Symmetry: C11
Subunit: 71 residues, 11 copies
């Protein structure tokens, strides 16, 4: 429960924050839908070892700021 | 007990800090409502591995400041 | 017992620092009342995984200064 | 025996540094009274997970300086 | 679990982020296709000890920024 | 044996550096008397979880410099 | 799964990133070919305790930037 | 055996570095005399949880420089 | 498996990076030959507790840059 | 095998670097003589919990530079 | 296997890097001869708790640079 985390702010409606399964197999286990202006703060966990952001978002990680772009 | 935490200051009444379940499943287990000017300082835990904020709020984490908008 | 802590200085009477329970269940277990000018320094612990401040206060955490407003 | 500590310097007589119990219960377990100019350097411990300061004092923690103020 | 991670932002369609198997044997176990403007934040794990990026992408690691070329 | 320590330099004769007992009970277990110009470097330990300085002294900790007054 | 990693960007076709075996024995166990513009981010592991880069590449480690030169 | 240490440089003959016992009891267990210009680098240990310097000395610790003054 | 590492870049042909055995005995167990412009990133390990560089090379460690000379 | 270390450079012949025993008992167990210009890099260990330098020497520790004088 | 290491570059022929035994006993167990311009990167280990450099050499440690004079 001490893992890194990412901060995602949706810059439009319908931004998808997608968790990919930890392990030998890689698939999406969850998509969190964010509407404009909502903020999600999400850890890497026993179940999530990779995170995909789809749509326009402002993203902060330990390595700095990055922005996803929609459509 | 040592884990990261988030600071959320409500900038309007009814800000909703939403704790999502750690584990194979993902659903909210708790929603803490804040009135304007109230501050919540909240850890990631055995039970919460993601936090969502709805409503207008000033948020600080280890990565800096971010603001949610309602 | 080296987890993080928050410093709260009441800027008016009747400030409440509230501890939220760690675990599957989330409820308030203690509200500490601070009057004007008193300072509480409070850890995250086995029993407290989130802290709510109600009323006007100057707060310090590892992420910097925030102020709760009455 | 590795915890954070607080430094408290009394700026008037009768400063109370109060230890609150670690655990499911929260209660006062000790009040240390300081005369003006005395310095207490106090850790968080197995028994103390929250500290209250009453009266005028100069306080240092890892988060910087704060001052308590008296009635 | 507390591992390092890599941030990849596709600057064109069809970018591939490829995980290479941890262990005595080295082969591809997964490729994640990213379209333009999508962001992947991927850890090293029990199963992935090297990551290859093919196509035009903006990459952030602990060592700074690097860019792959299409 | 890796706990924090405090540096106390007595600025007058008769300075007392007092160790308070770790545990459920809080009481003075030792008072080290310092004369003008002597330096005591003292750890927090299994037996000492709080230190009180009485008398005029220049004090250094991890949080910086502070001075006790006569 | 905590080790350091190396970032390799190929500046020409046919760059080889080569892993040397951990243990009493030292030999190449894998050579990953990178074409121009591809980026490999590769950890030290239970099986790799040394990494050789051959060909023209831009390399980042904790210690800073370095460039391999081909031919 | 990775604890803090203090550096003590005698600025006159007869500087006395005094090690105080770890434990419920507190008394000195060792006194190490230094002549002018001699340097002692001394750790906190299983047996020493506090160190007292008598006499004129230049002292460095993690918290910076401090000087003891003689009598 | 997270020890320190050295970065060696050969500035001429025939540079040798030589691993010395960990343990009570000290002998060379491997010499890696680097030709001009090749880079070797080599850890200290269970088997290697000292590394010797013979020949002209640019070297980076945690303590900074050093150059061996042929 | 991971402790702090001290660097000592002899500025004259006959510099002594003396190890004091770790434990309840304190005594010199080794004295390493350094001639002018020689450098000794010496850890704290299971057997050495204090180090004395006698003679003119340039010394480096984590806390910076200090000089012993003959 | 993550002790500190020292970097030694010989500035003349015949530089000796001597390892001193860890333990209650202190003696030289190995001396590594370095010719001019050769570089040795040597760790502190289970068997080596002090390192002596004889001859003219440029040295880097975590505490910065020092030169032995030969
Ligand atoms: N139940 C999920 C919640 C989660 C955390 N981080 C995520 C990132 C994306 C999607 C879901 C999540 C988990 O513990 O892993
Ligand atoms: N009982 C919850 C309290 C909590 C901590 N962080 C939160 C964030 C959001 C909502 C609830 C919480 C827990 O230990 O997980
Ligand atoms: N008994 C409580 C004391 C406490 C610590 N931090 C708090 C924050 C708010 C309220 C009470 C507390 C506990 O150990 O958790
Ligand atoms: N199931 C994969 C998911 C993953 C994490 N990082 C990756 C990098 C590339 C490809 C897949 C991944 C794993 O845990 O290892
Ligand atoms: N299977 C290899 C993958 C690898 C990691 N780093 C490398 C560097 C070079 C070559 C292969 C690798 C391993 O776990 O070690
Ligand atoms: N016996 C108390 C001493 C103490 C430490 N920090 C304190 C803060 C306030 C009051 C008492 C204390 C304890 O070990 O917990
Ligand atoms: N035998 C003593 C040596 C010592 C270390 N630090 C000291 C400070 C003062 C006096 C003696 C010492 C010990 O291990 O504790
Ligand atoms: N015997 C005491 C020595 C001590 C360390 N720090 C102190 C501070 C004050 C008084 C005594 C001490 C102990 O180990 O705890
Ligand atoms: N098999 C060797 C490989 C190696 C790592 N670092 C080295 C430095 C020099 C020579 C060989 C090596 C080992 O694990 O130790
Ligand atoms: N076999 C020696 C190699 C060594 C490491 N560091 C040294 C310093 C000097 C001489 C030899 C060494 C050891 O593991 O300890
Ligand atoms: N055999 C000694 C070698 C040593 C290390 N540091 C020292 C300092 C002084 C004298 C000897 C030493 C030991 O392991 O402790």
């Amino acid at each position: 429960t001490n893992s890194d985390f990412v901060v995602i702010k949706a810059l439009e409606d319908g931004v998808n924050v997608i968790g990919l399964t930890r392990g030998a197999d890689t698939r999406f286990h969850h998509s969190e839908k964010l509407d404009k202006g909502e903020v999600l703060i999400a850890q890497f966990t026993e179940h999530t070892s990779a995170i995909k952001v789809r749509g326009k978002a402002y993203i902060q990680t330990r390595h700095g700021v990055i922005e996803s772009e929609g459509k």
